[PDB]
Design a protein around this ligand. Structure first.
Ligand SMILES: O=C(C[n+]1ccn2cccc2c1-c1ccc(F)cc1)c1ccc(F)cc1
Ligand SMILES: O=C(C[n+]1ccn2cccc2c1-c1ccc(F)cc1)c1ccc(F)cc1
Ligand SMILES: O=C(C[n+]1ccn2cccc2c1-c1ccc(F)cc1)c1ccc(F)cc1
Ligand SMILES: O=C(C[n+]1ccn2cccc2c1-c1ccc(F)cc1)c1ccc(F)cc1
Lengths: 396, 396, 396, 396
């Protein structure tokens, strides 16, 4: 078993392992499009002696972080060990080689979506965003008197074919992803992919429809089996007006009993209704995972809450360096020190704080984050918090 | 139909309406104990002409709010209109009379638990705490290396009969409720009630067991039907050590597949495990609802985040007054003004901000909270936030 | 209603009855391939007066029996009476004609798979093999210290496309079926059929994958609806090493919760795991049914346990002859006699003993098998037992 | 943590651990009856420093083995570690002490029923009997022409109150348990227990009824929730006539859709019906587990198949001795040797062969049983087989 960069010869064997490893795999033509986002030397395979028994790669991504700052981000994906080669340390070996290449290429952060929740903590990945499923029983749903877009006249939302308004969805998504922590740039090939899956599959998913507002869209389809359930695959709104208007149109699907959506914990939808309970949380899971590749580079790059006053401390990342951390005026300076640490945490914990999804207080309570000063806990909580709520762009 | 304070003669008719209205009603002897928490003139009934077709009451409660401050709180409960007298405005009439008595008695706040989520917003109640059900698949659950109480030697947790350690549960609960926003004083009669329900019911619930630590306890029982599920009815821990230790003992129930608990969104349990996902959120609902009876009294009484700098604004509560609000040094001054409002909200929205469970940003996004200054939104968010996470004491 | 051999004209009407009668019917092109295994005069139809209201046929098969002996076997199949012509004795008539042709052609045995368990006993068919479904919860599955192929180095199992290793599957299956009681020769057209069904169906079954060892293979696919379940459609191993190795690879499908397989009661898989219970029996049914067409020919043809000592008796088959049966040195001589019978049984009971799947003791307990000597019961039990466990080849 | 024999003071603390550990626990009065079967020094507890955090005991039992031989048997039971004291090696310590006392007392075998299937292999226990649940859809069930007790006249089965025919059930059970491998003597206190559970529980199980034949009985009750299902809790028949007659009466419960029973793999019921499939196997699990305490004593004590001819070999039990094993004339001699081993197996594997439930062939296939001679495998298979099928007496 040797570890090396795949040649053209290796990709058919990688697609075989992919088909056997991943239940959501479409096939070679779709995989060949995703391939365009993998840089030269962004992929490792393990051959036996002969066929591919291990693979991993990263894609070049652009991640928005608090302060509307966009970081070049190594998006780890397509990771698979053959069922014939478990417990052979092939994951540990492939992750080590990719982290070396990612670090040497000058990415400040790596990111992934996790298939299981127990694999990636030990490689320094922390869960950094939270997914909420909301299911609305739309038969009882009335909008509050205070809810926007209640006034008379015409609706600003149109029902449209997704495929005929690509440009408008692209423009809205582009505005969205530059303003929101968790935001990813979506390149042409992933819009090609998204609109191909909006079309009806023979004995698969149904036709997708779009609701289009000047400042927002929602793609939705009726579920395969439950014909009384509408699944919102994507809702992107730049203004509160856009968000309320699209939910007025979705609650107006009078043939449906339930509207379901994967959203974020701070989604204001519950507050648009006279009965907050009608928007039930049916499901909740980690979204994006972060590995901080370079601590000073990452901590300096994001914005911090202007509210908390200037403060200084010493952060120790376990096997990741000790740093003098000065936060003030929503900026951070992070410099090498050998001064006694006031805060210790593993690198995964740092990933989990980085986008504001987790409070330092909560991780301290679980002893993932050690400190003898609770005034310092309060200050980190307040500083790392995000004014714009953190969201999840698309799975990769 | 007349509205008046019940006489001794009226209570048997109130117990009848209770039995028909509430599915969790035990009977007269249990109701007579709860009665001891209702003050003179704390109850209204509506008679037809003859029998009781409407009732409502409040109990004298002590609610802990951010800053470890304890407020006298009118706990609204036992509210019921006969099925024969719907849509007759009997709720509106009974709530109006109780709010008059509550206000004139000098309670700064009223609270309730809601049977439906759509009734109480219009009477000025806002949902102020959030309940999370976590279900742990304990067969996969391993504690993190960082998790407290991993070291060798003996366990500090004991398995005990609940009924033999009343005093220890009382002491721990008393410490807990003085330190935690949402905390209620539990009087003797509600401990009498709690331990009566820890005993096995013929063809009802099973024997309850306790795990006891110097600084925490957990009451639990196996479910009636699912003999592989343990339901934690109550877990109260004062220190992180206590909380981790009790979860070590609960994960040690090796005959169970699942441990379920109603907890709060900031519960650190997910972070004690190598796999955060093993602690799935199965259910999420509003807990305690607040009506701010007196705005200046309530806003002045709680503590605020020391982190945010001194700032001033004008809050307008819809049909509730306009106030000059100055927050600095974790204290507030709230005084009458006729100056132009910078923030408007209905009284229910204020209830929802009061314990820190909801961000002003989120309610602004739903237009429940109007302001033309987003720097002011950020400052309110930061000021009203609680350093100790808000929790739910007991249902009433 | 007349009974006769179909002409070319009749097959479209037979395919119509097939489509209406059998839920697993693919269509004419697939049926035309199976047709190649039906000899001249191996099919009967019943016409009304006009259209086909009844059909039955046998295929030329080669069945392995204990002692690695291969018998020419009439495989009864494609049996159907129109829903318009029930209770008209059309099955009794068609079975009578086919048994006449099968007997006159010189087949010692007939076999079938039964749609219902209550039809074929009365025509002399006995259930002769047993199917067990095992479902492994592979998340808990650890192999025993004693289990083969635990040692270091590389795996001998490869993950492959089924369609690219036809020759290797053919060779392994050929070795398997010559060594195992219940084994059937699989001709070219049934391998053509098997690999056509390994490909993904639009809105049907998913891609099939193969695990290939020098001495064994497993074909498997993820279930249509349960994406956490892998269905092993076929596992054929010649050595214990092959069998353990393939189960190591299947337990290594780390995206699956459950592996299901239709196997036989003596499958050693439970014993490869530290927890035998993890391999739960979810389902158990009769497999192959046998009708002994010629008693002396069949009894003489199979091998017997060398362990039991030489013994003699007189077997009476009800309306099937009386025979002097001498068993010794793992061989039998079976000759006409009019001597008093020591054992009586119907012909179906004999079919059920023939491959060793059922103990004579058990059938005696149900009085399907009469004898006044229990020493003789013990001797038959021991003699008819098979050293290699009896298995089921493929459905037909 | 110290290990010692409990005093009278310790039993209330043991009942507490029992209530918390075992979901089927009735209470002190029932436990005090079972206690009468525990000999002096048959129980160990582990105290912390104070309360009971560990317990285990054995009961004096009489186990019937092949050849109708009755062995004094240590029945291990009531084993529990507190949830506060897992992974402290308390089970390993308690099992070690009990095995010492059991061995020194002169029991040739120990037995238990396992709560999980993965705990007891490592302490030398092998699963030695198999439980089958059969569910009969009795609406389709017709008895075969060959089935006993079909003839005219009166039924020999009576429907009776269990409590009024204790003596008749006792006599039948006594005959049953002396003739059947797996049979246990049931003392007075366990008949007291059995008839107490035949009475209807307020909001628990329903009235139990008995079917009584001179040579057999069946206790049954309708299920709590499924009022169309009858659960046969116990069926004990000495003759085939008794067994068929009781099944005629059970199929005659014309208000029921389904009859369910926990029986053994060789139960002849399927063969009494025209449709064998109507008796579906819904569930299958290990019953009794055996630890051979003394190999020569146990191997010499049971009978062997008279059919197989005299043969000699050398058995090595892993860390349990090497023995010259001579089997002939259904008897065994087992003597110390240092001659090269021809068969190796762990002590648990031996337990699994001992009552005839598992074939040596099957365990050899899983490499739980090593031998270079397959003629020797065939001979062990044949020798250890039981003429009377192995059954499970009662859980303990
Ligand atoms: O992202 C993928 C994985 N992938 C590959 C092929 N695919 C077909 C249908 C879908 C996929 C997916 C997929 C990904 C995320 C998701 F949420 C759903 C599907 C990829 C990356 C680099 C490559 F070179 C090739 C593929
Ligand atoms: O709180 C109650 C209602 N109540 C009354 C009787 N009860 C019997 C069993 C339970 C109750 C409950 C109950 C409350 C909350 C809960 F979560 C469960 C039960 C009350 C208040 C003032 C009174 F004068 C009489 C009763
Ligand atoms: O065996 C068949 C029946 N048959 C016919 C057509 N088919 C299409 C798909 C499948 C079939 C099956 C089938 C059989 C067994 C099974 F397990 C699944 C399918 C046959 C025999 C002789 C003929 F002349 C024509 C057909
Ligand atoms: O066997 C028991 C366990 N036990 C104890 C108490 N119990 C109440 C109801 C049932 C029990 C059971 C029980 C056992 C097996 C079963 F299948 C169901 C219940 C025992 C042995 C020695 C003792 F000193 C005390 C108890």
């Amino acid at each position: 078993v040797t570890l090396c960069s795949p040649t053209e010869d290796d990709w058919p064997g990688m697609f075989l392992l992919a088909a056997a490893s991943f239940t959501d795999f479409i096939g070679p033509e779709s995989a060949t499009a995703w391939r365009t986002l993998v840089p030269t030397d962004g992929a490792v395979v393990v051959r036996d002696g002969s066929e591919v028994v291990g693979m991993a790669l990263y894609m070049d991504l652009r991640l928005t972080v608090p302060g509307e700052v966009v970081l070049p981000t190594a998006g780890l994906s397509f990771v698979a060990v053959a069922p014939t080669h478990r417990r052979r340390g092939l994951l540990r070996a492939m992750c080590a080689e990719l982290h070396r290449r990612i670090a040497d290429s000058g990415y400040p952060v790596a990111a992934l979506h996790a298939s299981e929740g127990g694999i990636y903590g030990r490689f320094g990945y922390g869960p950094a965003t939270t997914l909420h499923e909301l299911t609305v029983d739309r038969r009882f749903a009335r909008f509050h008197a205070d809810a926007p877009g209640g006034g008379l006249g015409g609706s600003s939302v149109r029902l449209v074919r997704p495929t005929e308004h690509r440009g408008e969805f692209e423009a809205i998504y582009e505005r969205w992803r530059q303003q929101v922590p968790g935001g990813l740039l979506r390149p042409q090939v992933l819009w090609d992919e998204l609109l191909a899956e909006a079309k009806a599959a023979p004995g698969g998913d149904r036709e997708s429809f779009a609701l289009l507002h000047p400042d927002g869209y929602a793609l939705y389809r009726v579920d395969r089996t439950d014909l009384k359930l509408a699944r919102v695959s994507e809702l992107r709104a730049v203004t509160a007006d856009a968000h309320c208007a699209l939910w007025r149109a979705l609650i107006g699907l009078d043939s449906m009993e339930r509207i379901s959506i994967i959203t974020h914990p701070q989604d204001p939808l519950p507050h648009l209704l006279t009965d907050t309970r009608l928007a039930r949380t049916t499901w909740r899971q980690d979204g994006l995972w972060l590995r901080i590749m370079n601590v000073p580079a990452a901590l300096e790059a994001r914005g911090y809450a202007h509210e908390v006053g200037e403060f200084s401390t010493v952060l120790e990342v376990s096997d990741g360096g000790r740093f003098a951390l000065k936060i003030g005026d929503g900026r951070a300076r992070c410099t090498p020190t050998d001064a006694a640490a006031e805060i210790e945490m593993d690198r995964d914990v740092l990933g989990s704080l980085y986008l504001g999804a987790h409070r330092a207080s909560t991780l301290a309570a679980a002893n993932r984050l050690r400190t003898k000063d609770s005034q310092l806990l309060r200050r980190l909580d307040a500083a790392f918090a995000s004014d714009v709520p953190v969201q999840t762009a698309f799975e990769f």
